[PDB]
């Protein structure tokens, strides 16, 4: 689909819609995670010892916000430039996932959880053209982190 001027315009618009509600969209995101794979719970410091996903934990929120920002920035960078750029951050990202016990087969867990999360966020505006646009941008960014994990291992 490439990322036409028209597709980019579609991701920006839908990201703005997400940040518009972080405590919601972020706790939703962790539930769609534990739906797709329950075991994942022992991994997060702020989920261990708990029984349910904390709803107002600042550690949790600041964590999940950072995750979606990174996927959006990725899509514009693809329409403008044509690529996703690897920096210091994405590399420190890759280290911390390894310390914590995270693997690659974990990644379609977090993707579906994010496409389903954005399908929920845009509702009727949803198009093929948009699904195509966030699918392209996640896949392009995941390709880049998995790359830094394998490197931190
Ligand atoms: C494009 C895809 C992904 C993005 C953009 C992303 C982003 C992030 C960020 C920004 C942090 C916090 C880093 C810090 O500041 O110290 C982090 C932590 C973490 N990540 Fe991910 N991530 C991705 C995929 C995954 C996957 C597939 C898993 C596995 C379920 C995972 C599990 C974790 C865990 C356990 C931590 C530690 C949190 C703690 O215990 O405090 N991530 N991630
Ligand atoms: C990362 N979640």
Curated annotation (Swiss-Prot):
Chain sites annotated for binding O2: 63
Entry's localization field: Cytoplasm, Cytosol; Nucleus
Tissue specificity annotation: Root nodules.
Pfam families hit by this protein: Globin
Main subcellular location: cytoplasm
Post-translational modification: Nitrated in effective nodules and particularly in hypoxic conditions; this mechanism may play a protective role in the symbiosis by buffering toxic peroxynitrite NO(2)(-). Nitration level decrease during nodule senescence. Phosphorylation at Ser-45 disrupts the molecular environment of its porphyrin ring oxygen binding pocket, thus leading to a reduced oxygen consumption and to the delivery of oxygen O(2) to symbiosomes.
Protein induction: Repressed by nitrate in a dose-dependent manner.
Top-rank taxon: Eukaryota
Modified residues (Nitrated tyrosine): 138
Modified residues (Phosphoserine): 45
UniProt: heme b binding residues: 45, 66, 97, 100
One CC-aspect GO term: nucleus
Keywords: Cytoplasm, Heme, Iron, Metal-binding, Nitration, Nitrogen fixation, Nodulation, Nucleus, Oxygen transport, Phosphoprotein, Transport
Stretches assigned to the Globin domain: 2-150
Any GO BP: response to nitrate
GO molecular function list: heme binding; metal ion binding; oxygen binding; oxygen carrier activity
Family listed: Belongs to the plant globin family.
PANTHER family, per the entry: LEGHEMOGLOBIN-RELATED, NON-SYMBIOTIC HEMOGLOBIN 2
Function: Leghemoglobin that reversibly binds oxygen O(2) through a pentacoordinated heme iron. In root nodules, facilitates the diffusion of oxygen to the bacteroids while preventing the bacterial nitrogenase from being inactivated by buffering dioxygen, nitric oxide and carbon monoxide, and promoting the formation of reactive oxygen species (ROS, e.g. H(2)O(2)). This role is essential for symbiotic nitrogen fixation (SNF).
Binding partners and assembly: Monomer.
Name assigned to this protein: Leghemoglobin-2
Species lineage: Eukaryota, Viridiplantae, Streptophyta, Embryophyta, Tracheophyta
